[PDB]
A paper describes a structure:
Compared with [name], [name] lacks a portion of the extracellular domain (ECD) because the first three exons are replaced by a fragment of intron 3, leading to the replacement of the first 89 amino acids of [name] with a distinct 25-amino acid sequence. Compared with [name], which predominantly couples to Gs, [name] preferentially activates β-arrestins. Integrating structure determination with functional studies, we reveal that splicing-encoded structural difference in the ECD of [name] can alter its signaling preference.
The structures of GHRH–[name]–Gs and [name]–Gs (apo) complexes were determined by single-particle cryo-EM at global resolutions of 3.3 and 2.6 Å, respectively. The high-quality density maps allowed unambiguous building for receptor residues L551.29b to H3288.59b [class B GPCR numbering in superscript (44)], GHRH (residues Y1P-A19P), and most residues of [name] (Nb35) and Gαβγ subunits except the α-helical domain (AHD) of Gαs. The majority of amino acid side chains, except for residues C131ECL1-S132ECL1 as well as P249ICL3-H2556.30b in the apo [name]–Gs complex and residues P249ICL3-Q2556.32b in the GHRH–[name]–Gs complex, were well resolved in the final models. Meanwhile, binding of GHRH yields to an extended helical conformation of TM1 and inward movements of ECLs 1 and 2 to the peptide-binding pocket of [name].
Residue numbers in the entry:
A (entry chain Y): 6 to 63
B (entry chain B): 3 to 343
C (entry chain R): 62 to 130, 133 to 248, 256 to 327
D (entry chain N): 1 to 126
E (entry chain A): 4 to 18, 26 to 65, 202 to 253, 265 to 394
The structure:
Amino acid sequence: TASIAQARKLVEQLKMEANIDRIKVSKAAADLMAYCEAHAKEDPLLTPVPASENPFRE
Amino acid sequence: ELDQLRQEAEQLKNQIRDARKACADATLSQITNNIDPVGRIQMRTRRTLRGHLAKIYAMHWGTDSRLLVSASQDGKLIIWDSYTTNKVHAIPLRSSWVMTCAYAPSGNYVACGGLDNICSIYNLKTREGNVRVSRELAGHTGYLSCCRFLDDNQIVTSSGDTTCALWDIETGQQTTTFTGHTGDVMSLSLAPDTRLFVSGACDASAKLWDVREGMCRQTFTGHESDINAICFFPNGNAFATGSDDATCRLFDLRADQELMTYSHDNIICGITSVSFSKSGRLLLAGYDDFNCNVWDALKADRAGVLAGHDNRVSCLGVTDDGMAVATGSWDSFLKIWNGSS
Amino acid sequence: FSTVKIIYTVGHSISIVALFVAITILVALRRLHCPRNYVHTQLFTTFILKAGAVFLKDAALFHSDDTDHFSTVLCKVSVAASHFATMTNFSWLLAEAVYLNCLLASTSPSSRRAFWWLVLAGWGLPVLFTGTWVSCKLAFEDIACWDLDDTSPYWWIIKGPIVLSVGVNFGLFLNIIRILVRKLETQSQYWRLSKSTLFLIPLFGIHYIIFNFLPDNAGLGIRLPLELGLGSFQGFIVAILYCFLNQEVRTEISRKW
Amino acid sequence: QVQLQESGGGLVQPGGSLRLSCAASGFTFSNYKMNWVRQAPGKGLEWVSDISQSGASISYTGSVKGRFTISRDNAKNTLYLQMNSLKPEDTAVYYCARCPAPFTRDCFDVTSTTYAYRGQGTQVTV
Amino acid sequence: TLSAEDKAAVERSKMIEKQLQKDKQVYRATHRLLLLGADNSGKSTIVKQMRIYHVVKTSGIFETKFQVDKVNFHMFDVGAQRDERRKWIQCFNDVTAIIFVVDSSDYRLQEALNDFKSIWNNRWLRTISVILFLNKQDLLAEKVLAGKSKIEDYFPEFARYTTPEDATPEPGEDPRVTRAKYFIRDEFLRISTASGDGRHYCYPHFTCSVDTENARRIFNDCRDIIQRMHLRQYELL
């Protein structure tokens, strides 16, 4: 029965999602913030490079 | 009994929601209240790439951060030297209704697809004077919404049938199918490690997929409406999602939930395209109104607007060196932006 | 007589400034660079030429005839200039009507071929005719100022193509009204038709039809205010109706603002 | 997440009346045009009624025009279908279907064989 | 001033721009059409008739090129997509017209009304005119002459609806057939006139299952759409 199979597959997927390890939102946010801070010098859109370095200069 | 299976699915959804809420120790906005604001990011159109006849529907930058492919529904796939504005190739597509294109990380291949339900793979380095079709991946039963090369041999593809597939380009066959979506899959982003990808669909869920295992690791469901665009945060640990609900949302894989949502009351147009800057601090989102808004991805405020388009922004990509953002639009123009000191 | 001269000159000045701004808008804002706006731009340039050349003509006729000197050559230069600028105005009014009729009649949208033939006719035919009138006045009845248009066998080299241009313009205007009636074919529809008709009257210079074919004395007392005086404002009226009231121009200037 | 939960459907005598009610959760209900859609057991899925963001615009099928009224309480994030004078023609699974995008009136896909923003439906038998 | 590699790159760019000029000419001279319609509509017989008279199983789009006088038409039939259309339909924002084919004989056509309303009111398909082929007119004639099914059962307005004096029936068709035809037409026109606001127009045509006039009909109302576009951009309409 197609609906039975579909609902079983959905239940199995939700069982696989339930059992994952989750970190706190605070630790996730802290890792994203630390990544941004570590690479802010390396990002030309955030921290525009001098026009002599910019390939798209006028 | 489907009623009993539905009840168990409700029970597991409740258990997942409870586990998410137990992880909501503190919000991203609270943690980033005391980081310094990005300030006003003014960007200038450094290049307007004009030569497409119809609306541009997709872009991809090369890994060289210089060559740009753009797909337009005139049936031209044009490859641009962004530095010079020179057209390096213009490929006659066998179907005009291209909706996606991809540039291979090697630069050897471009892919495109759309309502043909085919991902056509174009060899750019043939001995011939013009580009040739290498392969036509023909197994999808709906329109190709996105495609992304893992490598010269492997391309992930997403389709209007609620399914992604991983293709071996030499064999021309689906090595794997990613079936758990329930609406049209609209966008892919490959993780930097290339082992995971997330796909957003019209179901309003994003799903994390393992290319090797062929299985959905996580489903992210904070969005109200169709997730038109999805982009991995450069750490590979979070991703942004743009939706018709006029919001972006940031999801972290390990927190398994929405870290943050990017919305302004004045923004009622759906998100068409999303990209991060190389640091991840900027989320660039393209809109049905003819603007791209730059968001502080950590503070959820609008750092700026790319206001230079005259029709729906369709595609939006930051170079891998982060030096420029290109913005395709239905105005047929392909505007490339960078800041100034 | 002076009242006409004053209205005529001040309306031409207002036209010149509104046309310079109109042209600048249509040539700066690249989104407006449709062939339609190139024909509008060229018509506006022909109004600027007409205004400047009529100032040059009246200046040269008033100073060089008695006040300044050798300066008589500049009288001829001013008269040739005013005639060339007049024919360029009439030719581009006709080219506007021909472009719109080609657009509506072209089976494809790809009428871009017709644009270049319209530009070539719109400037080259005034050049050809002015040069032929010059070669004749240089060859038969050369007179110290060429303003003596009484030379019937040679003045019609300019007047004739004007008369034909305005006749063809009236025909094309009636064809456009036919098409537009068929598009509307019950109360606001006649408002739309009348607004479009009164939009086209300046753009095509159909107001010349009232005095086009006539002997030049006939109705002259009304001809002079209408053709000279209101015609001097015509450049300004067309500039308003086809730049500043075009929703495309308004949106483009707002989006740039 | 976006979930729609119809309720109030059941058996009714012909000519009887039922109020269906959908509880909408996980979206700004006020911003979305709402619909009822039904699948009668012998036929494909068919649209029944719609209601704009405010209820200022409403429409019905000809089977329904006088008999049912669609209404929404945006304060309770809930959609109603006051089905009066039910006929045996009306026996169907009734589904409450949100429109895809907010702020819009294009009503696409609500009748599709699968659609994300539609509830599991309530069986109405007459 | 360019290096030899920059020179060769500019020369390649210029050759590509020349090819793109030629393709701009071919593309802008072609009228792109989207053919919409339920599976019960004879849109397949319409593509078949035009494929005969003029000019991979997963393939989600079918193109039929056809030609009327010198005007080339590319008509696109969206075959192997899913029933959800709200995303792929946005591709057709640029098409000259949507040909919406209705099975007028099957009172399932309230679904066709709902599809038409959706196509007509969509934010990316407003400004696109709809060529509404009310197809299967012969089957509609038989259906209403047999009298075994009655439109007022499906549309209560039909009991009140009276045939307009604008109607130009065929000389032989019964007034009941005319009234049914024009009721169906006027329901689609009701939708078109509710919200088009002059940005786009609906062109009803009564077509038989195979009817060679259909390509002329599409040519005529493409010419009308393009004329109206030109008059709009001249601010004349």
